[PDB]
Scaffold this active site. Structure first.
Site, PDB file in Angstrom:
ATOM      1  N   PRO A  47       0.847  -1.218   0.000  1.00 12.35           N
ATOM      2  CA  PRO A  47       0.000   0.000   0.000  1.00 12.35           C
ATOM      3  C   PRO A  47       0.857   1.231   0.000  1.00 12.35           C
ATOM      4  O   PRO A  47       1.936   1.199   0.611  1.00 12.35           O
ATOM      5  CB  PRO A  47      -0.730  -0.092   1.333  1.00 12.35           C
ATOM      6  CG  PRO A  47      -0.764  -1.534   1.623  1.00 12.35           C
ATOM      7  CD  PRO A  47       0.525  -2.110   1.127  1.00 12.35           C
ATOM      8  N   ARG A  53       4.064   2.002   2.572  1.00 15.83           N
ATOM      9  CA  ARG A  53       4.798   3.256   2.374  1.00 15.83           C
ATOM     10  C   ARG A  53       3.898   4.483   2.514  1.00 15.83           C
ATOM     11  O   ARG A  53       2.784   4.528   1.980  1.00 15.83           O
ATOM     12  CB  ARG A  53       5.468   3.270   1.021  1.00 15.83           C
ATOM     13  CG  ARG A  53       6.782   2.565   1.049  1.00 15.83           C
ATOM     14  CD  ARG A  53       7.257   2.078  -0.308  1.00 15.83           C
ATOM     15  NE  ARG A  53       8.533   1.373  -0.215  1.00 15.83           N
ATOM     16  CZ  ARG A  53       8.681   0.130   0.256  1.00 15.83           C
ATOM     17  NH1 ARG A  53       7.628  -0.566   0.687  1.00 15.83           N
ATOM     18  NH2 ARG A  53       9.892  -0.425   0.292  1.00 15.83           N
ATOM     19  N   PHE A  92      -4.171  25.650   0.014  1.00 14.52           N
ATOM     20  CA  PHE A  92      -5.259  24.742   0.302  1.00 14.52           C
ATOM     21  C   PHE A  92      -6.542  25.528   0.494  1.00 14.52           C
ATOM     22  O   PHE A  92      -6.602  26.452   1.316  1.00 14.52           O
ATOM     23  CB  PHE A  92      -4.927  23.916   1.544  1.00 14.52           C
ATOM     24  CG  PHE A  92      -6.031  22.964   1.983  1.00 14.52           C
ATOM     25  CD1 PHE A  92      -6.708  22.153   1.065  1.00 14.52           C
ATOM     26  CD2 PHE A  92      -6.372  22.866   3.321  1.00 14.52           C
ATOM     27  CE1 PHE A  92      -7.709  21.287   1.490  1.00 14.52           C
ATOM     28  CE2 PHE A  92      -7.370  22.003   3.745  1.00 14.52           C
ATOM     29  CZ  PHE A  92      -8.033  21.215   2.833  1.00 14.52           C
TER      30      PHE A  92
END
Ligand SMILES: [Cl-]
EC number: 5.3.2.6
Lengths: 61, 61, 62, 62, 61, 61
Positions: free
Chosen positions: F1, F39, F50
């Site tokens: 993953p 990872r 953002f």
């Protein structure tokens, strides 16, 4: 713990038995409580005794 | 289905949340019901508000 | 000593009881005071009763 | 968490500063909360401002 | 926080659901962050679409 | 993953190091995967990089 579950009437003794056991295990499991302390009451709801949004559940669904 | 579960007070928000989930899945699994239709109310029982055999549960355990 | 501790609601009886014990021992230890003299009052804060920077805590978390 | 601690007056700055640190660590440790969310207010009690059993504390000690 | 998780395809809805929940809680917990603010995207990797060492993962495990 | 986590800026090394570990364990745990295969990439979001609802997050809500 004491669970009272309201369900629409229309089901097998077997299915309801399964509900009781499955629910009881979920309660006992998640509260880390003895199974023996878990009681389940099931209360069946007649076709014209349960409403969602002011309609009958039977009608809308 | 609408489950009202009575439990003794004194548990984490985390544990109650897991009760709700686990119970909901047990109901929707055993009735072959949509999850969306499953509603769970948890009603907490204060130490002095729950009796087993006429005596307080905290006491009687 | 009498400590009143305000905490956000949502914790196990066990955890709060640990808080009481731990805090009591920290007070008694650091003031070199008898444990018997140490009293602790927890006051729980409901999910809409505590604000940080004018916004609810639930929402900023800190 | 916000602890207000009432203590009798008469202590070194050092000792109070230890109290603050020790208590803060006990709260953070037992609630598994960030230290930086932990605030402590120390309120000192003057020698005639604290009573135990209707009698002054200085007089009866505990 | 916005986690995009790449995983090999082949897993139950149930299991992906638990990934979402667990990962969300780990993020909210470790950043001291409101859960509400945690968003998880699962994107799935087809058996021929993920390589380790120039090899298909499928193969090399 | 492989998780990529987008987070605002402004945290400890230590805190980010906890995020990585906590998340990794939640992935490994819920997928029944080896840790070693997990990872995590963490991508920090600058104060003006953002947006939520078209305003800056610095500024919502
Ligand atoms: Cl992999």
């Amino acid at each position: 713990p004491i669970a009272q579950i309201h369900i629409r009437e229309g089901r097998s003794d077997e299915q309801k038995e399964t509900l009781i056991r499955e629910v009881s295990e979920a309660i006992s499991r998640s509260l880390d409580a003895p199974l023996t302390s878990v009681r389940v009451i099931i209360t069946e709801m007649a076709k014209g005794h349960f409403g969602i949004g002011g309609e009958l559940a039977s009608k809308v669904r």
